[PDB]
Amino acid sequence: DSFPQYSPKMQLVCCRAIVKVFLALAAKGPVLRNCISTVVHQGLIRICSKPVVKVPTYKDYVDLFRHLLSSDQMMDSLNHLLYDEFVKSVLKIVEKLDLTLEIMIPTSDPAANLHPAKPKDFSAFINLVEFCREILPEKQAEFFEPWVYSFSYELILQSTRLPLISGFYKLLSITVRNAKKIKYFEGKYSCFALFVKFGKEVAVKMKQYKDELLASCLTFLLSLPHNIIELDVRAYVPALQMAFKLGLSYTPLAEVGLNALEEWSIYIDRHVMQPYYKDILPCLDGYLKALSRAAQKGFNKVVLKHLKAISLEEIRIRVVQMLGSLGGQINKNLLTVTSSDEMMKSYVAWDREKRLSFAVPFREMKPVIFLDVFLPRVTELALTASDRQTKVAACELLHSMVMFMLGKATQPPMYQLYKRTFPVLLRLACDVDQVTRQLYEPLVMQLIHWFTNNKKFESQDTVALLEAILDGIVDPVDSTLRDFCGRCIREFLKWSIKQITPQQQEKSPVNTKSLFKRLYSLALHPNAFKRLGASLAFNNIYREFREEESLVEQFVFEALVIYMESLALAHADEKSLGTIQQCCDAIDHLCRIIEKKHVSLNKAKKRRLPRGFPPSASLCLLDLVKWLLAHCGRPQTECRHKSIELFYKFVPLLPGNRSPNLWLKDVLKEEGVSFLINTFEGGGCGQPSGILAQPTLLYLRGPFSLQATLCWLDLLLAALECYNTFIGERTVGALQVLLKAVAFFLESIAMSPQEGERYNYSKCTVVVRIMEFTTTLLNTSPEGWKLLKKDLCNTHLMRVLVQTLCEPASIGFNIGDVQVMAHLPDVCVNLMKALKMSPYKDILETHLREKITAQSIEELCAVNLYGPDAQVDRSRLAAVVSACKQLHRAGLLHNILPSQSTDLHHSVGTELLSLVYKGIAPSLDLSCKQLASGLLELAFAFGGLCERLVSLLLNPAVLSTAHFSHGEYFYSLFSETINTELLKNLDLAVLELMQSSVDNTKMVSAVLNGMLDQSFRERANQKHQGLKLATTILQHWKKCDSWWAKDSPLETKMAVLALLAKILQIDSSVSFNTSHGSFPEVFTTYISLLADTKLDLHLKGQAVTLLPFFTSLTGGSLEELRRVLEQLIVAHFPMQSREFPPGTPRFNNYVDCMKKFLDALELSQSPMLLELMTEVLCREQQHVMEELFQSSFRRIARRGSCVTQVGLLESVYEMFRKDDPRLSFTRQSFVDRSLLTLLWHCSLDALREFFSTIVVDAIDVLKSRFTKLNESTFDTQITKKMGYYKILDVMYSRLPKDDVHAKESKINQVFHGSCITEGNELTKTLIKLCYDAFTENMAGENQLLERRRLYHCAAYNCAISVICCVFNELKFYQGFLFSEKPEKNLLIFENLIDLKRRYNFPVEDELNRHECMAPLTALVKHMHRSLRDLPSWMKFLHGKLGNPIVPLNIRLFLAKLVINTEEVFRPYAKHWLSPLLQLAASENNGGEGIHYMVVEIVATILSWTGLATPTGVPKDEVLANRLLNFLMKHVFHPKRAVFRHNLEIIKTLVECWKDCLSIPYRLIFEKFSGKDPNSKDNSVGIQLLGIVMANDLPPYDPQCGIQSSEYFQALVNNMSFVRYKEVYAAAAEVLGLILRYVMERKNILEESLCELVAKQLKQHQNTMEDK
């Protein structure tokens, strides 16, 4: 999994290691080669689980896997095993994945149904299909040879059920190409026949699939050998001539088409292909129409590293080459047939006379151009352009043209132009493009509305639009157009009655009834699509025409009749076309609409006469039901099914509301009994009566044509279906109908390359119907057995029955039709069950004995099943084992197979078990293993043999050749059937399993683990046997009392705890809680395992993972568990945070144990675990991993169970408040980072119960006075007070002002209870003592200082919280926490600030972590949002900060406060910048002056520029001057980034300083003066001179420093120092700048600098040139 996170030249070592470990794993005899099976199969899951496209994808793993199919390195000193095991893993993966799909009415299959049930499964499958495409297209020499048949069989089996899953075709193409690479299919024949059948089926199937699916189907189809599969080459031509037409955009499709055509032309003889060249060639003519960054740097070593599909032109070259190679005899066909079908049609004028006279407006000319000239090209561009910009431009232009022609129509006949344009609009409005579809949808709806309007009605344009929509409904393949045309016709019907009033709808073309007549006309058309679209039209107009009456009452019966006839007509064509699905849906909708409007409105008025009805003056429901009854038996499967179902739905719909049985009796009692027999044999005029026999009473017999046999078969099938459906249902008696044509058909089972297949299918669909008819007849009425005319059938019905169960291939069934074979065992077993009860069991069992005997199985099984031959020997064994399994499923195996027994069990089962066991003993083929598994399943199904099974498993026999153990390879090879048999016969298997465990520890443990894993997998299906197995294991523990002791070495206790973990994950929901019954034993095992110093703690890390299953006990068990846990944690822990240095596993083992403990704590809610964890955590100054603890406290604080969170909080609070001798650092930490974390991060609102349980005590401790007689007892009380303040403030801050401001529970606990005390009078009690804190008189206190300061800070935090929770609508801070009385030594901010330690404070935080910054800033923001300078806060703080008398640390603290929330102080930043600037410019800052404080202070000063300035007052003016001088003095820092930053601050300042005074000119001079030809000293000085010169500041030297003669000379002579570019470069730059300024500004100075710099430059122009 971690392979793709590597680097090249490194992704070879890991591959070599993988190959080496695989060789080592398989280096032993097979008892553990199955680990390879597990690992490769799991790695495939891991790869396919990656998201489909450093995030990794399968494209990274392709090289990894391809490196070990067959890439044998072999310098280390297997390929076949890896290849076959990978392919088996692919088969297993594709077997298990769930790829079913879930769903206005479309025709395309993947239109709305394409919504996978499990999208992750779909992503995994597509990942697998894309991965396998790059793994098995090569190295196919012999590895893929044996897998061809099984692989292909599984692929077709899967793909037949889900036909529209692209990827099965991709895998099939891969395997067929692999079979083609080697010699194959010469003249395995079953595989060839199945492949031919599926090729034909997919060829007739792919006519409806869209882009991706069609491409996959074509890539599969054209990959067929076709040197051998050449029969019916016409059936594959449309798959090739479409692979080219659909090409020109998907080049790989063109390549595969060209390869297929080349193979066909060369390999196939030139006698059958020659007539088929005029259909392939004419479609071929369309194909005839980094390093650069370096570049100019030399091809040196630099560019050495930089060197570390199929295009279209090559396709054209190959096309020309193949055209030439074809020869001149068969080259003319490419172009001779062109220009006569569509090419010359497109070269035709759309309209005879040009219209759309566009007069483009110029200034004076206004010429005329004709727009329709552009139409034939603009239309073609819009339909397809292969250029997004061109396509959208053409679409917009065509939209404009459409509007123009619509306008010009009503100022000129134009119907000749609409006929050529409306199909274009319909095709355009439903194309794949998004922006285009946004257009032409409203346009086409608007066109429908306009042409359906009364103003433009009955016109040629409206009928043209309707006709165009109609033939857009029905056409050759276009999946996404039929549904859109259905929507269009639905809108047409909706708006043709909304916009048209009935007075003109009687006599008018293009009305509702005319449209319905047209739909009926298309319904009976003998064309597939012509009636599919007709039915879809009603499918789309059923929502309409149903809310409007007076039409439902008119022609619903004729609609039903015409659609039944259409369904009958649609019997011949293919099912995959989906023409009967739409008709069935339409019939369902119309039946649902007739069952409501006629159940209460059944009349006999005039109604339309449906087709095929007798001439009648009236129609109702009764005659329709009579017609349905008379047409129940027809040789059309779907029509007959629908008619029978509709009749059964309609009989209750009669006004009598009678059940079908009594109505049928009443009809038969007076119409005659003979009226029903011919009804089941009528339908039309053709009959199984009349000719009352099989295909013997006909014109010619002996040899038959395919027609008449099919007619007779279908008629018999219809008669049988009607008989079954009217006999099984309790409507008529079985004796009221008793036909005879079944006589010969018993002998018809004894039987033109493809006619035989169709005849076999048509006879096989009849044999099963016969079997099920007999089954239902026997089941419904046993007393009707006598009328059964000797259905022993001269031992033929028994013969066909026995042939069906064993070898059902000689009676007609052919391999490939997977839909019918999956149903044969069901009907077979149903017939067996029906026959046994009826007095026919004797004949059945006697005839079955003639084919299946014990010796017959014995004489069929041999010792050669291990050999390569399988199609001859294993086939009969598979047939007989499947027959026996099916017979057993019928509840009858002991009679047909006699109970040959010696003492208790069947001899046949024991012999089968012995044969299977001896088979492995002196090949791992899939077929042989499957056959052996089936044999074992049958043998187990024969009876019991559970004790024999476990005895065979436990047998310590040794037999191996280079060394596994016999009796263990049996389970390792067979680990599925054995387990599922052991599960079903439990309560006796477990007893014998653990009867012998002391001497068979390993085998019993392995078998139990396998059984447990199998039961765990089977969860969510049985949900009961897992718990049964678990509780059975618990109720048998004393027998295995030999694994946990002072013996049974290390690798036996790990097995025990693994087994316990396995069982407990399936149990404890119902049992295992102090009352299971065997709880003491398992608890003692757990305690013994988690005890003393057995071995390393890692299994103890696994043992504590089971702790949550043992944390719910009560009554002393918790005492023992806690004592044991404390013992181990005190005997295995260092009692130190970092006793083990990092690195060595000792630290890793400790962190692993900590993580295990923490996981066990967070998954459950264990206060006993919580107290121990917080005791081991909150006792060091800083733990190594103090983030996992916080995360787990977060997790346990949000697990619900409000009664449990309060329990944990109560436990930890009771522990903290416990009075025990301690250093009190732990006492503080127990609330600093453990309890406060729970209280803050998450807690359910019912946490007030904890608050209600502490107010009665917390206030009491605070009220208690300190006893400072000893610091040993003083710090404990101090820390208790801090804890109480902290908890109180967290409750107050978190809880809103609804529970403490109203008396619900807390006020009841406080004071008395139900007093007045609405929301206060107790907060004041605590607020008074809190304000007493943090305001006490230190005076000369010396006992504790830091603890007192922390206590005062905690009290301040509590005060902030209680003020936040209090009303806080009026200023209460005058007497609270602000504006104290200094005259009484009530100093507030001068005690909680250390003001004794100096912070060293680099330039590149400490004060921001003063445990008061965040609360104070939050208070400031809250009270700013709770509303000149305010006197309570904004004036007290300013006065405290503006006086330098107060110590420093408080001043920097206040500065940090004001800069942290400078947003609040921005509006009033006029009295705040003066103290801020005074502090910034003060020399008293830390060290050489803290650059950090000054830089943020300054940034804040110019943060709010424009509202206040540092000038205007002498004091801040001189202070700012001092600040500027200090800044430009200390601007040098040897770090470039901070140097540029300082320069930027100076620039911004002087930008804001451009109102008052000064620049340290003397300091600048001293900075950039001084002779130094090897140092960059002047670089900084000239730089600050540049900043001075930047905006407008002149080199002002009338009176400053030194005279200008020296200043400018020092400025210029720096250029002579040539060692670094920047110094003299920027010196020249600033010299140019000052020259420009002195030239622009009229001053008599420029000549001097001009001559000076000229001399300086002339001093260079001869020695060095570049400078």
mmCIF file of all heavy atoms in Angstrom, residues 412-434:
data_model
loop_
_atom_site.group_PDB
_atom_site.id
_atom_site.type_symbol
_atom_site.label_atom_id
_atom_site.label_comp_id
_atom_site.label_asym_id
_atom_site.label_seq_id
_atom_site.Cartn_x
_atom_site.Cartn_y
_atom_site.Cartn_z
ATOM 1 N N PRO A 412 -45.000 34.739 -48.086
ATOM 2 C CA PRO A 412 -43.739 34.015 -48.279
ATOM 3 C C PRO A 412 -43.781 32.606 -47.697
ATOM 4 O O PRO A 412 -43.470 32.430 -46.519
ATOM 5 C CB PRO A 412 -42.719 34.882 -47.536
ATOM 6 C CG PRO A 412 -43.518 35.619 -46.520
ATOM 7 C CD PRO A 412 -44.859 35.862 -47.143
ATOM 8 N N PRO A 413 -44.165 31.622 -48.509
ATOM 9 C CA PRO A 413 -44.231 30.244 -48.010
ATOM 10 C C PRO A 413 -42.866 29.771 -47.537
ATOM 11 O O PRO A 413 -41.837 30.077 -48.140
ATOM 12 C CB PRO A 413 -44.715 29.447 -49.226
ATOM 13 C CG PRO A 413 -44.355 30.292 -50.402
ATOM 14 C CD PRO A 413 -44.490 31.709 -49.941
ATOM 15 N N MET A 414 -42.868 29.018 -46.440
ATOM 16 C CA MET A 414 -41.624 28.584 -45.825
ATOM 17 C C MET A 414 -41.649 27.145 -45.333
ATOM 18 O O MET A 414 -40.665 26.708 -44.729
ATOM 19 C CB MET A 414 -41.265 29.513 -44.657
ATOM 20 C CG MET A 414 -40.738 30.869 -45.089
ATOM 21 S SD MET A 414 -39.771 31.693 -43.814
ATOM 22 C CE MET A 414 -39.308 30.299 -42.795
ATOM 23 N N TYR A 415 -42.730 26.396 -45.567
ATOM 24 C CA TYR A 415 -42.802 25.031 -45.060
ATOM 25 C C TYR A 415 -41.723 24.148 -45.670
ATOM 26 O O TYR A 415 -41.268 23.196 -45.028
ATOM 27 C CB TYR A 415 -44.190 24.445 -45.318
ATOM 28 C CG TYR A 415 -44.472 24.117 -46.764
ATOM 29 C CD1 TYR A 415 -44.179 22.863 -47.285
ATOM 30 C CD2 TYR A 415 -45.028 25.064 -47.612
ATOM 31 C CE1 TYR A 415 -44.435 22.562 -48.608
ATOM 32 C CE2 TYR A 415 -45.288 24.773 -48.937
ATOM 33 C CZ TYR A 415 -44.990 23.522 -49.430
ATOM 34 O OH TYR A 415 -45.247 23.231 -50.750
ATOM 35 N N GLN A 416 -41.301 24.445 -46.900
ATOM 36 C CA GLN A 416 -40.196 23.708 -47.497
ATOM 37 C C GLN A 416 -38.896 23.921 -46.739
ATOM 38 O O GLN A 416 -37.992 23.086 -46.833
ATOM 39 C CB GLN A 416 -40.017 24.114 -48.959
ATOM 40 C CG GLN A 416 -40.694 23.186 -49.946
ATOM 41 C CD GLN A 416 -40.371 21.731 -49.683
ATOM 42 O OE1 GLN A 416 -39.207 21.357 -49.545
ATOM 43 N NE2 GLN A 416 -41.403 20.900 -49.614
ATOM 44 N N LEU A 417 -38.785 25.018 -45.996
ATOM 45 C CA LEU A 417 -37.585 25.303 -45.223
ATOM 46 C C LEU A 417 -37.666 24.771 -43.802
ATOM 47 O O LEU A 417 -36.636 24.409 -43.224
ATOM 48 C CB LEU A 417 -37.331 26.811 -45.195
ATOM 49 C CG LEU A 417 -35.891 27.280 -45.011
ATOM 50 C CD1 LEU A 417 -34.922 26.289 -45.620
ATOM 51 C CD2 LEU A 417 -35.718 28.643 -45.645
ATOM 52 N N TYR A 418 -38.869 24.718 -43.226
ATOM 53 C CA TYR A 418 -39.019 24.186 -41.877
ATOM 54 C C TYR A 418 -38.735 22.690 -41.836
ATOM 55 O O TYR A 418 -38.186 22.185 -40.851
ATOM 56 C CB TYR A 418 -40.422 24.474 -41.352
ATOM 57 C CG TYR A 418 -40.616 25.889 -40.872
ATOM 58 C CD1 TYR A 418 -41.638 26.676 -41.377
ATOM 59 C CD2 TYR A 418 -39.781 26.437 -39.913
ATOM 60 C CE1 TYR A 418 -41.822 27.968 -40.944
ATOM 61 C CE2 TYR A 418 -39.957 27.730 -39.473
ATOM 62 C CZ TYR A 418 -40.980 28.492 -39.993
ATOM 63 O OH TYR A 418 -41.166 29.783 -39.561
ATOM 64 N N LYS A 419 -39.109 21.965 -42.892
ATOM 65 C CA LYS A 419 -38.893 20.523 -42.910
ATOM 66 C C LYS A 419 -37.418 20.176 -42.795
ATOM 67 O O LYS A 419 -37.070 19.131 -42.237
ATOM 68 C CB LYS A 419 -39.478 19.918 -44.184
ATOM 69 C CG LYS A 419 -40.983 19.752 -44.154
ATOM 70 C CD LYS A 419 -41.476 18.969 -45.357
ATOM 71 C CE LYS A 419 -42.994 18.919 -45.392
ATOM 72 N NZ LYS A 419 -43.596 20.281 -45.443
ATOM 73 N N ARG A 420 -36.541 21.029 -43.315
ATOM 74 C CA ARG A 420 -35.109 20.796 -43.231
ATOM 75 C C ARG A 420 -34.485 21.363 -41.964
ATOM 76 O O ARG A 420 -33.333 21.034 -41.663
ATOM 77 C CB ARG A 420 -34.404 21.398 -44.451
ATOM 78 C CG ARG A 420 -35.016 21.005 -45.782
ATOM 79 C CD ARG A 420 -34.823 19.526 -46.056
ATOM 80 N NE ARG A 420 -33.417 19.178 -46.223
ATOM 81 C CZ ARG A 420 -32.888 18.725 -47.351
ATOM 82 N NH1 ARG A 420 -33.620 18.557 -48.439
ATOM 83 N NH2 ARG A 420 -31.591 18.435 -47.388
ATOM 84 N N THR A 421 -35.210 22.187 -41.213
ATOM 85 C CA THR A 421 -34.663 22.867 -40.045
ATOM 86 C C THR A 421 -35.111 22.268 -38.724
ATOM 87 O O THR A 421 -34.304 22.164 -37.799
ATOM 88 C CB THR A 421 -35.047 24.348 -40.069
ATOM 89 O OG1 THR A 421 -35.063 24.815 -41.423
ATOM 90 C CG2 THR A 421 -34.052 25.164 -39.271
ATOM 91 N N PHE A 422 -36.380 21.884 -38.607
ATOM 92 C CA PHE A 422 -36.872 21.340 -37.344
ATOM 93 C C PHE A 422 -36.130 20.092 -36.882
ATOM 94 O O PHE A 422 -35.850 19.995 -35.675
ATOM 95 C CB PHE A 422 -38.376 21.076 -37.448
ATOM 96 C CG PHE A 422 -39.204 22.310 -37.321
ATOM 97 C CD1 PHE A 422 -40.423 22.412 -37.959
ATOM 98 C CD2 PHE A 422 -38.753 23.375 -36.569
ATOM 99 C CE1 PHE A 422 -41.181 23.554 -37.843
ATOM 100 C CE2 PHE A 422 -39.506 24.519 -36.449
ATOM 101 C CZ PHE A 422 -40.721 24.608 -37.087
ATOM 102 N N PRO A 423 -35.808 19.115 -37.734
ATOM 103 C CA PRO A 423 -34.952 18.019 -37.262
ATOM 104 C C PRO A 423 -33.633 18.506 -36.706
ATOM 105 O O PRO A 423 -33.122 17.925 -35.742
ATOM 106 C CB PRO A 423 -34.757 17.162 -38.518
ATOM 107 C CG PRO A 423 -35.960 17.424 -39.327
ATOM 108 C CD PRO A 423 -36.292 18.866 -39.103
ATOM 109 N N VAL A 424 -33.074 19.573 -37.276
ATOM 110 C CA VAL A 424 -31.829 20.124 -36.754
ATOM 111 C C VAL A 424 -32.031 20.661 -35.345
ATOM 112 O O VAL A 424 -31.210 20.425 -34.454
ATOM 113 C CB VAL A 424 -31.288 21.210 -37.696
ATOM 114 C CG1 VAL A 424 -29.961 21.720 -37.184
ATOM 115 C CG2 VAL A 424 -31.158 20.661 -39.102
ATOM 116 N N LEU A 425 -33.122 21.395 -35.121
ATOM 117 C CA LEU A 425 -33.381 21.926 -33.787
ATOM 118 C C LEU A 425 -33.619 20.806 -32.784
ATOM 119 O O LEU A 425 -33.139 20.871 -31.648
ATOM 120 C CB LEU A 425 -34.574 22.877 -33.824
ATOM 121 C CG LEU A 425 -34.300 24.227 -34.480
ATOM 122 C CD1 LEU A 425 -35.593 24.982 -34.697
ATOM 123 C CD2 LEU A 425 -33.343 25.040 -33.637
ATOM 124 N N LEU A 426 -34.360 19.771 -33.185
ATOM 125 C CA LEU A 426 -34.602 18.650 -32.282
ATOM 126 C C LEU A 426 -33.304 17.935 -31.930
ATOM 127 O O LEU A 426 -33.076 17.582 -30.770
ATOM 128 C CB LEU A 426 -35.597 17.675 -32.907
ATOM 129 C CG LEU A 426 -37.003 18.216 -33.156
ATOM 130 C CD1 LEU A 426 -37.915 17.109 -33.639
ATOM 131 C CD2 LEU A 426 -37.557 18.850 -31.902
ATOM 132 N N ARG A 427 -32.439 17.714 -32.922
ATOM 133 C CA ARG A 427 -31.148 17.094 -32.654
ATOM 134 C C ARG A 427 -30.269 17.981 -31.788
ATOM 135 O O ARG A 427 -29.477 17.476 -30.987
ATOM 136 C CB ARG A 427 -30.440 16.781 -33.971
ATOM 137 C CG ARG A 427 -29.576 15.538 -33.946
ATOM 138 C CD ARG A 427 -29.631 14.786 -35.272
ATOM 139 N NE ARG A 427 -30.974 14.317 -35.594
ATOM 140 C CZ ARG A 427 -31.832 14.959 -36.375
ATOM 141 N NH1 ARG A 427 -31.517 16.106 -36.952
ATOM 142 N NH2 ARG A 427 -33.036 14.435 -36.584
ATOM 143 N N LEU A 428 -30.386 19.300 -31.945
ATOM 144 C CA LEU A 428 -29.530 20.226 -31.219
ATOM 145 C C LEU A 428 -29.969 20.399 -29.772
ATOM 146 O O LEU A 428 -29.124 20.591 -28.892
ATOM 147 C CB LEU A 428 -29.524 21.580 -31.929
ATOM 148 C CG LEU A 428 -28.237 21.964 -32.654
ATOM 149 C CD1 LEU A 428 -28.454 23.213 -33.486
ATOM 150 C CD2 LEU A 428 -27.102 22.157 -31.677
ATOM 151 N N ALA A 429 -31.273 20.329 -29.508
ATOM 152 C CA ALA A 429 -31.794 20.606 -28.178
ATOM 153 C C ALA A 429 -31.528 19.486 -27.186
ATOM 154 O O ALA A 429 -31.771 19.676 -25.990
ATOM 155 C CB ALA A 429 -33.296 20.874 -28.251
ATOM 156 N N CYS A 430 -31.046 18.329 -27.640
ATOM 157 C CA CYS A 430 -30.805 17.201 -26.748
ATOM 158 C C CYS A 430 -29.396 16.644 -26.895
ATOM 159 O O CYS A 430 -29.161 15.479 -26.564
ATOM 160 C CB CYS A 430 -31.836 16.096 -26.986
ATOM 161 S SG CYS A 430 -31.614 15.194 -28.531
ATOM 162 N N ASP A 431 -28.453 17.445 -27.381
ATOM 163 C CA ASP A 431 -27.100 16.952 -27.565
ATOM 164 C C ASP A 431 -26.344 16.946 -26.238
ATOM 165 O O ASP A 431 -26.823 17.432 -25.211
ATOM 166 C CB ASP A 431 -26.360 17.790 -28.604
ATOM 167 C CG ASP A 431 -26.172 19.221 -28.170
ATOM 168 O OD1 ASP A 431 -26.941 19.683 -27.303
ATOM 169 O OD2 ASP A 431 -25.255 19.885 -28.694
ATOM 170 N N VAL A 432 -25.137 16.378 -26.275
ATOM 171 C CA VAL A 432 -24.347 16.202 -25.061
ATOM 172 C C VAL A 432 -23.896 17.543 -24.495
ATOM 173 O O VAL A 432 -23.726 17.683 -23.277
ATOM 174 C CB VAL A 432 -23.156 15.270 -25.352
ATOM 175 C CG1 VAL A 432 -22.357 15.781 -26.539
ATOM 176 C CG2 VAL A 432 -22.271 15.112 -24.124
ATOM 177 N N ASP A 433 -23.712 18.550 -25.348
ATOM 178 C CA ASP A 433 -23.179 19.829 -24.899
ATOM 179 C C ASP A 433 -24.105 20.483 -23.880
ATOM 180 O O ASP A 433 -25.330 20.369 -23.953
ATOM 181 C CB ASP A 433 -22.974 20.767 -26.086
ATOM 182 C CG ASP A 433 -22.128 21.969 -25.733
ATOM 183 O OD1 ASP A 433 -21.478 21.943 -24.668
ATOM 184 O OD2 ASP A 433 -22.113 22.940 -26.517
ATOM 185 N N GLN A 434 -23.499 21.175 -22.916
ATOM 186 C CA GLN A 434 -24.241 21.800 -21.829
ATOM 187 C C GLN A 434 -24.775 23.175 -22.209
ATOM 188 O O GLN A 434 -25.971 23.441 -22.056
ATOM 189 C CB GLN A 434 -23.353 21.907 -20.586
ATOM 190 C CG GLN A 434 -24.067 22.446 -19.359
ATOM 191 C CD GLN A 434 -25.444 21.843 -19.174
ATOM 192 O OE1 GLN A 434 -25.595 20.625 -19.092
ATOM 193 N NE2 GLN A 434 -26.458 22.697 -19.106
#
